[PDB]
Amino acid sequence: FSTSDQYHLVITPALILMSQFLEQIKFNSLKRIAFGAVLVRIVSQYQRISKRYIPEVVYFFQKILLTFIVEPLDFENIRLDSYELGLPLDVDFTKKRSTIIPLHTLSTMDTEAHPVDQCVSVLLNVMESLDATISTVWKSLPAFNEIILPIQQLLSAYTSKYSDFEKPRNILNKVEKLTKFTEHIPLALQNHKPVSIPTHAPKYEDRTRSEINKMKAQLKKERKFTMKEIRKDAK
Amino acid sequence: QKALPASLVPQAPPVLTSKDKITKRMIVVLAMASLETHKISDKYVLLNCDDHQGLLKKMGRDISEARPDITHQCLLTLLDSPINKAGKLQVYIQTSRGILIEVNPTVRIPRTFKRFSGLMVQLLHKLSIRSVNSEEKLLKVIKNPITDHLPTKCRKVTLSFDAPVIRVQDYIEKLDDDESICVFVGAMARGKDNFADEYVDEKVGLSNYPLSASVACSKFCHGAEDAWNI
Amino acid sequence: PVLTSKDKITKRMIVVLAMASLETHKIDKYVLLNCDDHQGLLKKMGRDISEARPDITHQCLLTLLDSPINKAGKLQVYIQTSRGILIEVNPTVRIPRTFKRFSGLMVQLLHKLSIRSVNSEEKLLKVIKNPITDHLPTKCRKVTLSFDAPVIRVQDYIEKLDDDESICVFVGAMARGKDNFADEYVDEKVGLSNYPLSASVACSKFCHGAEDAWNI
């Protein structure tokens, strides 16, 4: 179907359904983590064709990054679901690792035998999706600074913790050039066209009532005339 | 450092009529206009130059004189100008015979001349023409003189060719902060420029070339809008 | 000097009356399509009654030709009618001030395909063929007067114009209709006030802006 329209008879219920799926589910399993990652991918494609904004997606990015490197004082405002799954300093960060490689039913059936290769795979999948969605939407939205601020703080936490990854560093430089490029001028929403003076149109050019009035005029005129002629004759 | 007004919704400025005499405004008096009504026989009709010259000659007047088309187009450009939208001018037609006609800034004039002529004969006999919403009189015949119906602190100037040309924005910005301006515009086809010498303070010109009266009104009006920042 | 389409160098102003309703018919002689003069005629023709407004065209020509920039001789008038015919008007024309004589003159122009005076040295109304860029000057800045466009000060705009760049403006003379008539030609669109204007006051505002810009 066509997603780029404003209202769709089946897509907008599907949008809010995957919205509920994106938000309400609990994050206890890497299976559900990959489920959320591929939901992020499909809504990113939907907005590749449609170009709108989703705060549930930016909160989702926050949630996934902090539930990966929970391993607590820097971001306690998130209320995570699982504290046990963290990635220590054992990443290989080799370029020939497993890519996003979406084989859906296969991955969701062998997820519970979870290797750190697959954890870094879904992590980098979320990383590439976040980079693409930022580059297509986030720089164009006006609140970009405070939208991306918690993501930027989590990324600086990543770099200070590890200092070995490269895609976080490149995303840092990209959002840095974005915040150096944007001007961030305050709002001017309430400023309207002054209304004009009202205008009006001029007006220019009952049969029973008309006939009544004409007969009254006839009666008056002929009665007065007959009285005058009577009195002339009498004198 | 300066707070906002509590209401920021746009509201229509109040219509400036002859009753109110305080608010600074502009007044245009299309003077020496030619609006006579004749009776042919079954029906009355407004005198026009082009169509009826044998009976105009039977009157004996000038086909050159009896021209209402220029008053018509002057009224069009005036009441379509942006300052009428802002509600800051009102107009008065001073007929050659002696009528004073007050035209409210809210009226929507019919633009084809036969409709305008029917409107004008209905006005010059009925003395008043009401809106189709019918709560107000737009075209009111009022009584001489214009000094009796003008604002109290006003300046009355004539549009003459032989006066030295000035810049209309300069003159309007030279005016005081509550001293309104009233321009006498000669709505004659062709004639002398000395009819309102007992009414006015001074004469001004706007170009080294003669103008049509509609263009003169448009020049003065756009200079006024440029001055008052519209 | 009298400006013409053959000169394409000197700084000048060009006005374009887009979709201007100048339509004729023969009833047993000719007639212009007047909106008020006949309505059952337009209903027989199937054409919309509220479109044929040569009165508005006449108002625009009258204001433009009597404007002082026209007397100084710095403009030229092109009319692109609703049926696709280009009409060229020179700054030396004394147009009729009456709608009836204007109607007769337009229908005689449409049925002669040329108009020359009794002086007969050079024509006044020229029927010529679309497009218009063949007769436009070289360095033409093309603007359309639209309401949805941002507002500008005409003084600042003509100041920001170049030295010898001529200026061409496009105004729609129709009653109701969208302003997307000449997007294939035009560079940009501007607005003039926060209030919706008309054709006559639009061209008058622009010619007075040009007058005060070029110090006439």
Binding site: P198, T199, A201 | D80, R108, P110, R111, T112, R115 | C35, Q39, S50, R53, A175, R176, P196, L197, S198
Partner: peptide, 10 residues
């Protein structure tokens, strides 16, 4: 409301 359209008819 009205903006440069002329007027109605009967």
């Amino acid at each position: 409301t009205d903006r440069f359209k002329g007027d109605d008819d009967i």
